[PDB]
Structures are given as structure tokens and as C-alpha cells.
Amino acid sequence: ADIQTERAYQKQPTIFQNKKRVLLGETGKEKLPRYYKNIGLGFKTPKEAIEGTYIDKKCPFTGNVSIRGRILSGVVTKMKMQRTIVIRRDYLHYIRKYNRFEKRHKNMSVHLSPCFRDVQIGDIVTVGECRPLSKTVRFNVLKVTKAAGTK
Amino acid sequence: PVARSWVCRKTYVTPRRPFEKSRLDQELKLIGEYGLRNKREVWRVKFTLAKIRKAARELLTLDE
Amino acid sequence: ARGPKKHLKRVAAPKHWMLDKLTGVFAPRPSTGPHKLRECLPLIIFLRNRLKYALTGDEVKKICMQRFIKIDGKVRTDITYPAGFMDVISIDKTGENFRLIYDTKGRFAVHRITPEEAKYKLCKVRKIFVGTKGIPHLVTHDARTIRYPDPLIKVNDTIQIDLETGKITDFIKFDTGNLCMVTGGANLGRIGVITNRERHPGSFDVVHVKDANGNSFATRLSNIFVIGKGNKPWISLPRGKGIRLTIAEERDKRLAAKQSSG
Amino acid sequence: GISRDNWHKRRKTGGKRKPYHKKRKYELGRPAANTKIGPRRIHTVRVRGGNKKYRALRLDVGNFSWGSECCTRKTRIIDVVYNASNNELVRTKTLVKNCIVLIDSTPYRQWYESHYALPLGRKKGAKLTPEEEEILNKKRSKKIQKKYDERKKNAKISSLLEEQFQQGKLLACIASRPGQCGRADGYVLEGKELEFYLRKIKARK
RNA sequence: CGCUACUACCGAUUGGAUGGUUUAGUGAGGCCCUCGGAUCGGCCCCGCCGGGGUGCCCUGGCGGAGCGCUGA
RNA sequence: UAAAGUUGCUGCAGUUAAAAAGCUCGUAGUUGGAUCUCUCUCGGCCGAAGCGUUUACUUUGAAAAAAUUAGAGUGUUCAAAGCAGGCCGCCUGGAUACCGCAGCUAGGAAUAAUGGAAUAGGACCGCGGUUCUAUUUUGUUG
RNA sequence: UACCUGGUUGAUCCUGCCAGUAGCAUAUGCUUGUCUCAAAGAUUAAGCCAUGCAUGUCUAAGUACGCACGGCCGGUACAGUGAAACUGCGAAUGGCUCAUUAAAUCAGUUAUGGUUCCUUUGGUCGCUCGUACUUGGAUAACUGUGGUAAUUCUAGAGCUAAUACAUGCCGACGGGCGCUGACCCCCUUCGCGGGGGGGAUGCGUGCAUUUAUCAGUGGUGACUCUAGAUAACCUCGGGCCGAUCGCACGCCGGCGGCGACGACCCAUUCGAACGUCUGCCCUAUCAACUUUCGAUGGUAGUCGCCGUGCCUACCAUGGUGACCACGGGUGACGGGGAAUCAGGGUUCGAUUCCGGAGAGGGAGCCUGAGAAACGGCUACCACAUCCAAGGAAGGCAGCAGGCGCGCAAAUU
């Protein structure tokens, strides 16, 4: 679509799109191979990442983000930011005096690559730790599992 | 910082009830029978036996 | 703090140095060198606390500055020089060679070796990388860099270094069935055959090891040091062969030894 | 003498944070190198670890690459025409990374003429200046002539680049950071990137 | 209610002394930038005694009275 | 601090001693009935053999400073200590346990939560079907 | 040792508190023979400080014409010891204290594939095709002349060194490789449609830096990794490629052994820095907070050692909260730990170990690998020292010691 929405040109820094090609040797568009990498830890590169046109330098698959550290999960709580969502991690904290637990939660802002189209509120996301991407963001969505009630 | 060690330990325990006739009589009998200087010697031997009993009890709660 | 620290408190020193608590406030802070601060034995601890060749640090300095102490074939005059695992200490004046080898309690034993064994040392290769127009390079746990290693040598293998020339003369691969010592963790100083390596991508691989007496333990891969091909070590082992007796068997052995005298 | 700490900022919750220590030297920042276009002027900066940064205050010349032809040349920088960050940087003609500049096309024109034996950016009314028809034509044997003829099959240049060569100055993007390395290196704009930046420049002016 | 003692509270006694917080203005000092250029030094000119190079004044010792360059 | 079961998780009280909201609804919170006993490398004993929806729990195994605490040895003259020492050069110590919670790991599968197909958008599978892998089994796009 | 006792009534049984009881920690009172350990100006005042000391440093191996000592009277430069001074290194460790500080510090757990790293250790260091049998100018110390009341103030003049500061070359070195391309040979069809070569002048070559592009030696779970190739750049504030010192002595102009020191670069060590997950006291008489005085995210940049609203410009309108946000208080540094304790808990932790912070309060820096350093500097604020009134010099929460404060803490 309209990839060039910013004031600066948007492109994958590792893909050279200005190679000289003669006109008569054209099959489809002239030349635009798409850069992507397979992240480790058994995660599958989304098909939209391989055959997409979006430009996201913070994408785990087509961007400049290396996933290393903790692999966590959460439920999507808010999706009101650009390429960023807020997930909620619920857990039980043990108070030893009463030998009991209490519900606590942490809100975590994670980068959502546009390769995960159709991500709802309430479905599980597996996020991986990366370098600080902004003031509060340090995790990238690596997998999206749909909610149980989602048809 | 010093090259000194402050590991020190009190070797006895003072009884909870200071003026108890039966305990006073028992301790005085021990003092006289064994020629002890004061009640602290009785309390020291009592503390030794108490620690030994506590260790034995804690061992008796473990699997054989 | 600003900049690096230069002191080591005696109580913050590694416990395997077996330093007491009333000698002083400070422990000899190991100098920077081939081995890490907590995985080394400084020369002063070896020459004073283990060998009793000196009574004070002044006498350790007096010995070292006569150039009587060689570490890995080179004379060292630094009394806090960090000597670590597999390092060979040669005192030619007294004609004795030692190899710094862990005890089953996790301590560097005073393990005397023959002068023929003192010619070489085992080194666990820490990394392999290509640099300098295609030249392969190898880095060991001893922190020595070797150019042009054998193409079959990989990370976690063990090489044999001839101390006179410092080049690889043999190597054991990291394979199941090879003898290995443990150089860190709870099982430090134990010797056994590698049984299996469970791999955890993005985390620490765990290696399972079986003693010569049939006891099985496990460590992280970073704590495994291959010693010999098969179950035959390429170095001399201490009096305890890496078999960690339980406290009951230690008590029984001590009582049997005591009752045999008198 | 500015700072670069993250603890003077509000927390994620928006609450105020209390500084538990004064500014540290490693959190320091330095004034921006507003790299102008002019005769070369670079001030070396001593940085953490004892290393050196090259704070370019003035640069008139850079190293720019024609990517399709793989022709990298040293070239005078003429002007700053577009800045995606701040339009003011264009008004002050500041060289920063990713700013669009005009570079002299003469080195790339010279390489093209000496490589393809084809005129480029040359007005048809003119009949070449003295002492350059030789490098265009020369006296070559059959082998050299057939080599240049084989090169001629892949010598077509896109119309946008051709028009730029007619005007004598090319559009380029600065890809190095002049305030950190003292250099204004970059690449000539081509293809859809050139189309986008021409559209942006003409929309701005 | 009358006394006696003590304790908080209300409050313009338009009460006296320090503690901080902040609009407006001013702002030391350092650092950066753009200049500046007191001085100092090199190559040719009233330094021109002297060299393995003889009527080769051209030095490796003295304002060489130089809108002549040049570096600090 | 214990005594204080006078802060009560264990483990307190609320008719009259101090105390249950005037009464209902109601969100969050808390708590919730039964029920469900192959291995798309196969080679003439060895390995690419799978958190196999998941979690909580439980049992492991790693990894986790020392000192302190517990605790092993050791006649400091005894002891608090100390980490020493013992035998006519030699011999032996400087153990070990514990190290909540969270993180990692691996067995169990009761208990508890959760999931699987009802608009069939269902499991196994024979038969088809319209872009396209940059290795073709040995004179190289002859 | 899983413990209770006295007190309401005329008497009783209760609820219930008061008092008792034992430890612990500060103070204090009375008393005190031996001996071994051993805390000790935390609490109030991170209040103020007289004086003294607490950080300096030389090997055979940087620089010795100080007769300051000291010889073997000489083509014998330097015997040797050696103050001083230049150079190098350290002074960023240690010690003190707990004021600040409430997801901050800190602890465990991970990460740096997002960084810097003096030193140590190992490697690399004729891999660059372009005066050397050693280059230049200074400046200390020293001599001599001085100024000021005053300082670890320094100013002229006369010398003279380098491992200080600069400059800079034979050599390896024979050339190879890449891109050029005046010219020549052989074969097929005299449609050279094609090939194969030799090639003279020319440009550029190694490592590092910057940019663009290409191809897929080793490695990772995963690189936009490592290595390679190409086109070039290559910072006057210009980077590596040794103009250094000692010892032992040699060998038919040459070839050398053992070291010291120094310089890139890459590892290593010691770290530092910045992130991940979880965990912190009381308070609702604190319920909404933040929002370009960047608040949350996006794009581009700047700056920074690097990731990042760190900052800037545009864009979006976000982000946190009864699972207690935000605000407030703390006679709050966090932890390891301490006291007490049947089981469970309660309280404490200024205090010798680890981490943080600070040096009267703020702020800003220089040098350096490392400091926003205070036994470094600069300024302001408070206090304060000497003065000849012009100026100069300060920082005990270091060790003693003094004043003050106090219930409360030792030797100049």
C-alpha cells in the first residue's frame, strides 16, 4: 500500500533496490527482494513477514532486533499505540505469614510488528526480550495465540 | 575493619521464674553435692544438656 | 566506586583459598591475568599457605624475586600472579613440579607431577574465530591465543599445549564417553565420563557425568573440562581420583586409618 | 554541559522521580555539531575510554557512491535541500545524517564517459570542449572497441538521473554522521527513493 | 455555679525568629561555538668571517630596518 | 521480644461484657456441585526419539559470596574461641546441611484452573488442482 | 520448659486491662580481686574545627658535567654512589559516614547479538612497493638577578639532557594482484559473428577509519556476525608500521643471545555502565495522575561509550490506577544478617562483609583508562583564617584531639 507515510524514505537498510536492470528482462516488478531473518528458539517466521511490504526496524523478523533473554507471555490489553501494544501479565504472589497468595499483575508495553495482522484484545502473545526499543518497551511480540472464545 | 573475631556466646540461660522453691532447692542440692561456686554453673550444665536434647529431638524427627 | 578496586578483604576472598580469619584484614588480591579472580590461586597462597616454603609475604617476595618460580614454563616474579586450573608450577631449585588441579572438595590440591608431565598442559578452548585474512584463531581457558589450530578443533574441546613452544600437540573432542573434570559449581573437582549433553538453546547446556564408582551428577557446560579420551586421563590426577566420598564414607575412612596406627 | 541520564524523566506511570545522586561524567552530553557547508574544519573530541571523535564543524567535500554503477567518488557538497527531521536544518544548511544534499556530478560524469564511451549531461548544441573528445573516442583496437560496445548495451541511465546530470548536480543522501566521524559520506539518490525525495522537495518549496 | 491545677482547640493579637516551594527579571563560573591575535618560530631581503664544492655571497653563528608566505 | 489466643494465618471476638452496616441490589475481590481408566533416515544392540495444547502443585537436578546460624573433626590447660593440628622428615584437616520468593531444569498427573467440533471454519486418508528452491550422479549454462 | 501470678465483688464466675515475670539494647547508680576475648561520638548536630599526621614512588635496564661524596691523569664521552629536577606510574584504591534515597538503592535472576575497559596474560607487530653508523628545537635541575606583608607565589637572564616534545629514512623490495590498454602471434568460413595468449607506459594496493555494493572461511537458538571481494575516502584537533635502555659476549663490513621499556590492534583479566523478571515500610483526613516545562508510542536525526524521549522536529493520543496509581510521611541507605521465638510470628539491622551515596550546600569542570574526584580545580551560598587593607588562603562524615550537642561514646 502506502509504505512511504513518514517524511523520510522507508526501506530495509540491507536491501539495495537501485540495481540497474534492462527493461526487456522484467518479470513482475524490477527488483525488490525482502529482507527477513529467522529468529531462534524455534519460532516460525510469519508468512506476512516474508511476503509483506511494511517497513519496521523494530520487527523481530524483518528489522534490526535480536531476541535474547527472557521469553514471556501475556494477554493483549490495549492496542491504542502505533506498532505497540500493552499486555497484562497476571501472577500469584505468595505471602508466607498467611500461607496464601494474592493476585498481582504487571502491564508491559511490547512492540507489535505489522506482520501480526488481526491481533485482538485478550489473546495470548509470546514476547521475547530485546534491547530497549523506547522508554518503556523492551519486548517484541514473537507469537500470537488467539483467545479461546474467538471464532 | 579489624582482624578480630566477635563470635562470642553466652553459655547459660537464666530461669524464667526467679523465686521458685522447688527449683531453688534442686539447684542448691546440686551445688552442695558437686561443690559448685554459684547457680550459674548449674545453669551452664543445664544449658549444655538442653542444647544436646534439642539436637537429639531435631534428629529424631528425621527419617531413620 | 570510581575506577577499579585494588584490595580484597580476607573474608570476601574465595573460600577455596582456605584463608583463616585472624591473620589480617586483607587477602592478597590476585593480579589480572590468565584466570579469573575467583578461579585462581595466587602465587603467595601457593608458596606460603600450601607449601609452607615461606612464613610471610615478604619471604614469598624474596623467593619470587630470585626467579625460582616458573608458571607454565615462564618465570613469574608477581607474588599475586593468578595461577589457575591446569597451570604447571615449576621450582627448579628444589626440582619439583606441580599442576594446579582441583580437589573433590573444590580446592587446588598440592599435586606433584613428574618433570616429563610438566612439559605440557591441557587447555579447554573457549572460542574459535577467523581473523586476519582467513587465519583461524583459538582461545583457551588459559587465555592464550593460538593461530592455525587444527580444523577439527571446536569450542569446548580440550587441546594439549607444549609449554616450551605453546602449540597444539593433541586434542580431545567434547564427546559423550570422554573423561572430564568439573571446574565450577557444586560438583567442582569431580572426575567422570560424560554421559549426555542436554541442549537448551538460548540458555545453559547441562552435561551429565558419571563417576568411576557409578555416581551420576550434572553441571553446566561451562563447568566441564575434558581431561582424556575415553576414561583414561591425559594428566595425573590427585590422590583422590575425582571420586567424592559422602561424609559417612569419609568418616569411615578416617576412622579406619586412625585405628590402623598404634 | 548537558546530561543524558534517564532518571530525570517521569516514570511510566507519570509520577515524579527523585534523583539519588548528582550528575555522573559518563551520563554527559556535548553540544551538537551543527556541521555547516564550508571549507573543512574538524575539532577532535576526547571521548570515554581515551578514544577520539571527529566533530566536523565545516565540510565542503564528501565521499558519495553511485550504487547502480558502483562508482564512489570524492565530491564537493553544494547545498542542503531536504531534511526529514527539521525544516530549519535546511534553512541553516546543516549537514546531518540522512539529510538530502546536492553534490557535484562531475566525477561521476567523468567516470561514466571514460567507462561507457558515452556522453552524459552534455548539451547537444555544444561540440565538446578541447582535449576531451579523445577520451570519448580515442584510437582503440578491435578488442577494446568491442569491449566498449558490449558495455554500451548496459549504459542506459534513468531519465531522472540524466536530467540531474544535465543540471550538473546530483541528489544524494548523507549516510555517515558528520558530528561523530568528521565525514559527510553518502550515496546518490536513485530509483523510487529519488522519486520520493523529489516529490518531497517540490512539495516543500 | 464557685474556686485550684493541667491539656488540647478556635482565632484579624494585620504578633517576633529560621525552614523551604515557585511566576517575573537578573545571573557568577565552567564547557562548546564564531571571532580575535599580545607574542613566539620557520623559508627570500643592510644574518653575507666560515664548506668534502676553485674568486657560483648559497651557511648549520647576530634587529637580516621586508601588505611576503607560513605554523603555534 | 516472649508472656499477648490482649491483632488471633496457625488462633480471638461481635445476643446481654467493646462490637452485625436500617434494609436490599450490585461491580471489582474472594469462593464456587457431580462427571471423562508412530518417530515424513531406517540402517545387519546403537542414534535428529516428542515441555507434545498449558499452568498451578509436588519431587528432582543445576546455579546460587564469605562471615553469621546449624553442624563434622580438633584437650585453647577447660570454655567463649580458633582452624588448627597429629606421629616418630612423615600423616591428616580446613567437611556438610540450610540458602524463602522469583528465574532455569526434569519426572508424577491426584487436586485446581484452562483447551479442543454444533453454523462443522472437525479428526485419518485414496483422487485431483492455476506463480514458484539458486543439488540434478561427473568433458562446466556444447 | 508449648508456664503464668496479683488487682474491680460482701462473696462468685467472667470480659478486660493494669501490674508483675524472663531475655535483649542504650543510659545511669552502687560495687569491683584474677584471667581471655572484645564494642566504643550511630542516635542529638551530614554541627563547627586549633594542631600534627593520613600518598607517594628507582631498577642492571628513561634523563646525572650538583665535586654532594668518590677513583686508575686520560683518543679515558659516560668508573661508581647519588641530592635536585625532567620523564613515567599511582593519587578514581583504602578509610569515614548514613544526609539523601520508597521499584529508587538493593537482592536473587538473566542480557549486552546495545557499550567502554589502564593494567595482567596470549597473539599480531619486513603482510604497506613508496642523516639512518641516529635528525630538530626547547626546558628543568644548576648559576646569577629579583618583586610582594603574606602562600607548596613565582618573574627576567645564562647553560644543558630524554623513553619529555617533535621530525623522519635505508631495508624487507623480488615483485605479485586488480583495473587500463600503443602493439603482435595461432586457428576456424576470405559473414574476424569466435576465441586463446604475450603484453610497454599508467593508476591503486597492508592494518585501522567512513560510505556504498557484491558473494556466499568459520560460528550462533538467532547477525545487518566473522572472514572475503569491489568502488573509493582516509580528519592539519593526522592512526600503526621502535631514531629507547641494560647485561653477556661473540662469530669468515656483515650475522647474533638474554632481557627492560614503548606503540597500535585482537582476545583475556579486573571491572564499569546500561537493560530483563520478581521482591520493599506506614498512610485514602492522598482517587485519580501524566500530557510536547516529553507525558505514552512512531519516523528521522542530534548527542552519547553504546540501547533508549536522552534531547530535537514532525506525527499519533496515548501511558498508570482500588491487584491502591499519584500524593504524603518515615527518630527509611538496601542486603547478608541481629534479638526473641513450641509451631506461627514480632521487632531490629548507623555499625567492620557486598552494593549505593556523600565529602559544609548546590553547580560546573580539568587531567586521566577510570572522577562530575573534593587530603583536584572554578564559581556562587553559609561559615571562617592571615593581612602592612593592596591582597592571600579554606573544607577531620580520614587517624588522634578540641568545642558544641546531648542520657549517651576512648590516646593530639
From Swiss-Prot, chain A:
Residues where Phosphoserine is found: 66, 109
Regions crossing the membrane: none
Subcellular location: Cytoplasm; Nucleus, Nucleolus
Citrulline found at: 21
Sequence positions bearing Omega-N-methylarginine: 68
Modified residues (N6-acetyllysine): 37, 44, 57
Pfam family, one: Ribosomal_S17
GO cellular component: cytoplasm; cytosol; cytosolic ribosome; cytosolic small ribosomal subunit; extracellular exosome; focal adhesion; membrane; nucleolus
Covalently lipidated residues, kind S-palmitoyl cysteine: 59
Domain of life, source organism: Eukaryota
Single Gene Ontology MF annotation: rRNA binding
Main localization category: cytoplasm
Record keywords, A-Z: Acetylation, Citrullination, Cytoplasm, Lipoprotein, Methylation, Nucleus, Palmitate, Phosphoprotein, Ribonucleoprotein, Ribosomal protein, RNA-binding, rRNA-binding
An example Gene Ontology biological process: translation
Modified residues annotated as N-acetylalanine in this record: 1
Function: Component of the small ribosomal subunit. The ribosome is a large ribonucleoprotein complex responsible for the synthesis of proteins in the cell. Part of the small subunit (SSU) processome, first precursor of the small eukaryotic ribosomal subunit. During the assembly of the SSU processome in the nucleolus, many ribosome biogenesis factors, an RNA chaperone and ribosomal proteins associate with the nascent pre-rRNA and work in concert to generate RNA folding, modifications, rearrangements and cleavage as well as targeted degradation of pre-ribosomal RNA by the RNA exosome.
Entry protein name: Small ribosomal subunit protein uS17
Origin species: Homo sapiens (Human)
Curated annotation (Swiss-Prot), chain B:
Superkingdom of origin organism: Eukaryota
Protein's cellular compartments: Cytoplasm; Nucleus, Nucleolus
Family the UniProt entry places it in: Belongs to the universal ribosomal protein uS4 family.
Role description: Component of the small ribosomal subunit. The ribosome is a large ribonucleoprotein complex responsible for the synthesis of proteins in the cell. Part of the small subunit (SSU) processome, first precursor of the small eukaryotic ribosomal subunit. During the assembly of the SSU processome in the nucleolus, many ribosome biogenesis factors, an RNA chaperone and ribosomal proteins associate with the nascent pre-rRNA and work in concert to generate RNA folding, modifications, rearrangements and cleavage as well as targeted degradation of pre-ribosomal RNA by the RNA exosome.
Subunit structure: Component of the small ribosomal subunit. Identified in a IGF2BP1-dependent mRNP granule complex containing untranslated mRNAs. Part of the small subunit (SSU) processome, composed of more than 70 proteins and the RNA chaperone small nucleolar RNA (snoRNA) U3.
Protein name as it appears in the record: Small ribosomal subunit protein uS4
Annotated source species: Homo sapiens
Swiss-Prot record, chain C:
GO CC terms in record: cytoplasmic ribonucleoprotein granule; cytosol; cytosolic ribosome; cytosolic small ribosomal subunit; extracellular exosome; focal adhesion; membrane; nucleolus
Keywords: Acetylation, Cytoplasm, Isopeptide bond, Nucleus, Ribonucleoprotein, Ribosomal protein, RNA-binding, rRNA-binding, Ubl conjugation
GO molecular function: RNA binding; rRNA binding; structural constituent of ribosome
SMART domains in the cross-refs: S4
Protein's cellular compartments: Cytoplasm; Nucleus, Nucleolus
InterPro entries the record matches: KOW, Rib_uL2_dom2, Ribosomal_eS4, Ribosomal_eS4_C, Ribosomal_eS4_central_region, Ribosomal_eS4_central_sf, Ribosomal_eS4_KOW, Ribosomal_eS4_N
Pfam families noted in UniProt: 40S_S4_C, KOW, Ribosomal_S4e, RS4NT
Sequence ranges assigned to domain S4 RNA-binding in this UniProt record: 41-103
Cysteine pairs bridged by disulfides in the record: none
Keyword flag Nucleus: yes
Swiss-Prot/TrEMBL GO biological process terms: cytoplasmic translation; positive regulation of cell population proliferation; positive regulation of translation; ribosomal small subunit biogenesis; translation
Modified residues (N6-acetyllysine): 232
Cross-link (Glycyl lysine isopeptide (Lys-Gly) (interchain with G-Cter in SUMO2)): 229
Acetylation listed as a keyword: yes
Annotated family: Belongs to the eukaryotic ribosomal protein eS4 family.
Complex and partners: Component of the small ribosomal subunit. Part of the small subunit (SSU) processome, composed of more than 70 proteins and the RNA chaperone small nucleolar RNA (snoRNA) U3. Identified in a IGF2BP1-dependent mRNP granule complex containing untranslated mRNAs.
Name of the featured protein: Small ribosomal subunit protein eS4, X isoform
From Swiss-Prot, chain D:
Entry-annotated residues carrying N6-acetyllysine: 36, 127
Pfam families xref list: Ribosomal_S8e
Subcellular compartments: Cytoplasm; Membrane; Nucleus, Nucleolus
Modified residues (Phosphothreonine): 129
Keyword Ubl conjugation: yes
GO biological process terms on file: cytoplasmic translation; maturation of SSU-rRNA from tricistronic rRNA transcript (SSU-rRNA, 5.8S rRNA, LSU-rRNA); ribosomal small subunit biogenesis; translation
GO CC annotations, alphabetized: cytoplasm; cytosol; cytosolic ribosome; cytosolic small ribosomal subunit; endoplasmic reticulum; extracellular exosome; focal adhesion; membrane
UniProt keyword terms in alphabetical order: Acetylation, Cytoplasm, Isopeptide bond, Lipoprotein, Membrane, Myristate, Nucleus, Phosphoprotein, Ribonucleoprotein, Ribosomal protein, Ubl conjugation
Lipidation (N-myristoyl glycine): 1
Phosphoserine PTM sites in chain numbering: 159
PROSITE patterns in the cross-refs: RIBOSOMAL_S8E
Membrane topology summary: Lipid-anchor
InterPro entries: Ribosomal_eS8, Ribosomal_eS8_CS, Ribosomal_protein_eS8_euk, Ribosomal_Se8/biogenesis_NSA2
UniProt biased composition (Basic residues): 7-25
GO MF, any single term: RNA binding
Keyword GTP-binding part of the UniProt annotation: no
Positions of crosslink type Glycyl lysine isopeptide (Lys-Gly) (interchain with G-Cter in SUMO2): 169, 192
Ranges for region Disordered: 1-26
Family according to the record: Belongs to the eukaryotic ribosomal protein eS8 family.
Quaternary structure (record): Component of the small ribosomal subunit. Identified in a IGF2BP1-dependent mRNP granule complex containing untranslated mRNAs. Part of the small subunit (SSU) processome, composed of more than 70 proteins and the RNA chaperone small nucleolar RNA (snoRNA) U3.
Protein name: Small ribosomal subunit protein eS8
Organism, as annotated: Homo sapiens
